[PDB]
Design a protein around this ligand. Sequence first.
Ligand SMILES: COc1ncc(C2=CCOCC2)cc1NS(=O)(=O)c1cn(Cc2ccccc2)c(C)n1
Length: 854
Amino acid sequence: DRVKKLINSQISLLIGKGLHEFDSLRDPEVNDFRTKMRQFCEEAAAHRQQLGWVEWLQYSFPLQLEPSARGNRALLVNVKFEGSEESFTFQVSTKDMPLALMACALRKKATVFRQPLVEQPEEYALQVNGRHEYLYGNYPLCHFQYICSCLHSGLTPHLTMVHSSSILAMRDEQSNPASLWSLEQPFSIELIEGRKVNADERMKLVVQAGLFHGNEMLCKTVSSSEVNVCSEPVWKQRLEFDISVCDLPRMARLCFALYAVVDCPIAWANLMLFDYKDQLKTGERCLYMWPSVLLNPAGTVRGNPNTESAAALVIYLPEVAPHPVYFPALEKILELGRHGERITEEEQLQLREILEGELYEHEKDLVWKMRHEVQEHFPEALARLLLVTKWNKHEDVAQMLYLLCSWPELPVLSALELLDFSFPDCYVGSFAIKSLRKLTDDELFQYLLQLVQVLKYESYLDCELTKFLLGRALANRKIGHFLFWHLRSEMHVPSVALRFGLIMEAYCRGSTHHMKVLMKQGEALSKLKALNDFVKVSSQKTTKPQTKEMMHMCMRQETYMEALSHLQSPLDPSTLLEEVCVEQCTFMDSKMKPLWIMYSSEEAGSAGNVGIIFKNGDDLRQDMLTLQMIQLMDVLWKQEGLDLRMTPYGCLPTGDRTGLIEVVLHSDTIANIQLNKSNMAATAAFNKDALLNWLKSKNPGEALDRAIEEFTLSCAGYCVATYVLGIGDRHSDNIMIRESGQLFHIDFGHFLGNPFILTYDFVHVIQQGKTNNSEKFERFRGYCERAYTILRRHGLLFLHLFALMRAAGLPELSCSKDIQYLKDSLALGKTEEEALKHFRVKFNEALRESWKTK
Ligand SMILES: COc1ncc(C2=CCOCC2)cc1NS(=O)(=O)c1cn(Cc2ccccc2)c(C)n1
């Protein structure tokens, strides 16, 4: 009671909506989800408290492995023991494992402390200093991301020996407290009246209604008659559809569109015909309509929360039978689908050709006929077969479901295709999730953004995907972190606020301690929004140095100092944002005046000096998606042994036009480097030299050659990344360069088209200052070609991922026309020889554009 009230109030604070609002709906579906999902999440919390210390480290601190390790050299390492000021620096090998490194630190300590130790290397874990990152398991040292980062950046790994007891004590501190088929009658409804309708009185009103199974129409759309435009239009008419009640699939949805004709749309609303308990809906239903910007089947099946302002459409769902009618159970379906129906040698080859991607009408009749041959010989062709199935014929669906339920578990790639709205069947969705269960946390984390979007196409609150995502978030603290932030950022959207809000409440019941951690993070973002508003005002009246000192005063207050300090980074929970360095903080000159908040850690040293950018006024969803795609490219390339020294820095929308960006330290823009400022080391005689002179100055003597190599490699990666992804609006200010030579792009507002790019100032670097250096240039051309063909081998993965992101609601990613850019860029409808010929020609075409500068 005393703690139940507090947990509830903290959840309300955290999710940005009171739990009383949930109960105010007096909604069975909402109530049944809450009860069932609190129970499922409490079971998770209990499982966690009975984990072993290593399994608990796998929960709180999942391993950060190098892409090539997933599925020799000398190394200087610094080790200390938790509580001790003293440390040991020793030589290890990249091929050595943490148990060898621990056994070694236990020897040094045993000789310094003069006694043979009882403790064994198996009782310890290696914490990365001042980070929520550990090194454990039987993986050689080079396979860990931290060790790799260190090896490249020339820094010494600083590790701490954590005893199992310390980890177990840590666990306890973080513990939770204690029949349809007989009805041949056509589908009919009554369009009674409209309410709160606003439109031109010169025009007339009409209602268009259509029956959908996803996108595919179940029958012809039906329109009402033309009534006069007013606030309350009264139709009181019948709309009969050319489909029998028996043929209604489980996931059938009635779609409405209210518009004004002489063509202007007013509003849209849809609903499921069967409720969450599989009962066919009857009685009077009020559809609180959403504004239209003519049917929208993809749109949500829940009403517009703004009941006061919104237009309403009152409909009557007629009583079909004297008793309640439920959708048949799987047992009745697999019974009807069991009984069905030889094939010819030539039609067996015609099939092998069209299963190896739209088809003609006669081929559908062939893929349907050979459905058992599809299951047995081409199991990966499920999706094409599912698209030739008539979801308007109840026996054809029964036949399909009989095969799906015997169908083997598909690879992840195929299962991702099945999450598309094009496959709205629930037994199809459950099958897809069943085939995704084999995703590792690293694969899961990679596609997590796309899976949160898929949640928006869901017709009900209680689903296998919510159960899947919830179970995985509670079993891995990093997944839980990012599932929380993807949902939390979309709370300002009334169409997803209910589902996302209820999901986040469930997670919180399963993770009280993590709710407290995320509360600390929201508390910091609250102060930043308030510091940003002050900065936005102050800067329009006073000068930038003055506004900066005023920002520093405002930050120095008790509430600001406590909120902004000692939190886990929402960009990386492994990164602890410790001590805010007030003197180093500032903001950009742009419209939104984004804040640059700088942090330091006494515990983490060099690695604790981090920077975050708080942005308010701009939508950061497309930046995040692009950066995630660049990250995917990098993983894909590293898996094929290619490290193109990419910088896919963190970017996280946190709320309404609000987000954080990861500051890449020790980097500058080409614009600032090119400014060729006097009384600087880099001062060039010719602007073509500025970039190379800046590189020379940050990398003395022997180091310059490696910086030129870091530049070339990262240049090859971004040339391909921006080409494949259609990144435009490229200027010297949104192309950055790191002190180590790595080139990277920022600010991804325009992608998917909205020609390949090459600059002679980059070519000068690649060529080591030499005017003619085709040895070095062509090495770069080959880096592009190898990178491009690795991406094409995975072209389907980019397509399936981008397809799922149509649910996100991005204006530059909403229809098929957008994904055509990727189809063209990855030239997937061609052979590798025909695509590589096209890459070479586009690289040569981008070169002839560059040569105009030279
Ligand atoms: C989407 O917007 C952003 N995306 C990424 C960044 C990052 C900056 C550095 O670390 C990597 C991430 C920053 C922003 N937003 S902004 O308003 O700060 C910004 C700064 N700049 C040029 C600039 C950069 C650095 C130093 C001086 C000036 C531009 C063009 N935008």
